[PDB]
UniProtKB/Swiss-Prot annotation:
The protein's name: Maltose/maltodextrin-binding periplasmic protein
InterPro entries for the chain: Maltose/Cyclodextrin-bd, SBP, SBP_1_CS
Predominant subcellular localization, coarse grouping: periplasm
Task performed by this protein: Part of the ABC transporter complex MalEFGK involved in maltose/maltodextrin import. Binds maltose and higher maltodextrins such as maltotriose.
Length: 366
């Protein structure tokens, strides 16, 4: 009471967000503490269930349906004037059972990021990457490194030739129809595993390692979102942001997230949380503060987004988004993500075959 605690992931602009919080404190006397706990998306539903946790939680919209189903989120009530300020499709991402359960902030999609000095013309296909890696390994470089620990990053390849999460049918997802074990999913994961077994990639590679390699010019390419650009800017690597490579002639299909801010149902500061989000954060100046720390991607706020749209990196982001699909927000997404995380880790490390890993994933996801 009389305080705001906010959780946002450590890869986002939490210092920029904190600057908005300082402005809020200056105006209102309400202190705002921004934190970035590890695994906050799993931590929230645990501590919020007891009525603890943050006043406001930031995460991609996919997790919010489950939070809402658990009664963990307060229903938000922006009026017409405010809703008209954000793109309709962003409001769509934070609707659950007819109710708005969060404020949309920004649209995120993975792109191919490449080093222009090592790779003036980036590959259009996944298939050519092994040969490119061999050429680079002769120079002590690698072609591509990206986070293999989180299925968010491998999904675009798995989905390329036909993998999918849950079948969409006329407004509803059929949670009994999962596409993680079909021929398309298997072809994509098999290709990934082949890269690893043949030493073009390392099963070990995680977010920090991939980011390190790209930003020090050790690898020619990486796969990451808008938040990553800030650190590359500092590294002085000459980079481009472009369309993900195709697989079997088909576009890579990233799962698109809408970074959203939910209010804890157990919060005694719901009115203040709304005031902060609507009138401090979701303004030209508020989003700019966060964006300048770590880029948000394409923001939900029309007035600022139409300025950001001039950025070819954002154009690239949305080109990839359009080839991909907006994540469902249904409660079953958590089971889906866990199933696929396990499958990719087990296949990549050789603990299971691709067929065995994905068969288990099909069961676990549904
Ligand atoms: O890997 C599964 C994971 O994917 C998504 O998480 C993304 C997040 O959306 C992005 O904002 C970014 O920060 O990277 C995360 C992956 O490390 C889903 O949103 C999440 O629920 C899911 O577990
Ligand atoms: Zn603390
Ligand atoms: Zn942290
Ligand atoms: Zn109003
Ligand atoms: Zn090879
Ligand atoms: Zn290891
Ligand atoms: Zn190094
Ligand atoms: Zn260094
Ligand atoms: Zn009120």
């Amino acid at each position: 009471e009389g305080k705001l605690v906010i959780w946002i992931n450590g890869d986002k602009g939490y210092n920029g967000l904190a600057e908005v919080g300082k402005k809020f404190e200056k105006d209102t006397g309400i202190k705002v503490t921004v934190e970035h706990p590890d695994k906050l998306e799993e931590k929230f539903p645990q501590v919020a269930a007891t009525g603890d946790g943050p006043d406001i939680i930031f995460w991609a919209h996919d997790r919010f349906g489950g939070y809402a189903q658990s009664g963990l989120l307060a229903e938000i009530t922006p009026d017409k004037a405010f809703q008209d300020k954000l793109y309709p499709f962003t409001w769509d991402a934070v609707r659950y059972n007819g109710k708005l359960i969060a404020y949309p902030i920004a649209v995120e999609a993975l792109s191919l990021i490449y080093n222009k000095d090592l790779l003036p013309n980036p590959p259009k296909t996944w298939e050519e990457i092994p040969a490119l890696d061999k050429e680079l390994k002769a120079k002590g470089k690698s072609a591509l490194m990206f986070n293999l620990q989180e299925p968010y990053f491998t999904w675009p390849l798995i989905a390329a030739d036909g993998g999918y999460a849950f079948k969409y049918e006329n407004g509803k997802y059929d949670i009994k129809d999962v596409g993680v074990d079909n021929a398309g999913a298997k072809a994509g994961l098999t290709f990934l595993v082949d890269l690893i077994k043949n030493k073009h990639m390392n099963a070990d590679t995680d977010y920090s390692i991939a980011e390190h390699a790209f930003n020090h010019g050790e690898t020619a390419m990486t796969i990451n979102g808008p938040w990553a650009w800030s650190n590359i800017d500092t590294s002085k690597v000459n980079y481009g942001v472009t369309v993900l490579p195709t697989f079997k002639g088909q576009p890579s299909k990233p799962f698109v997230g809408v970074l959203s801010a939910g209010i804890n149902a157990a919060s005694p500061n719901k009115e203040l949380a709304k005031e902060f989000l609507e009138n401090y954060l979701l303004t030209d100046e508020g989003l700019e503060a966060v964006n300048k720390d770590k880029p948000l991607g394409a923001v939900a706020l029309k007035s600022y987004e139409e300025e950001l749209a001039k950025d070819p990196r954002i154009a690239a982001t949305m080109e990839n988004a359009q080839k991909g699909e907006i994540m469902p927000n249904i409660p079953q997404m958590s089971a889906f993500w866990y199933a696929v995380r396990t499958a990719v880790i087990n296949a990549a490390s050789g603990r299971q075959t691709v067929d065995a890993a994905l068969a288990a994933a099909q069961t676990n996801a549904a």
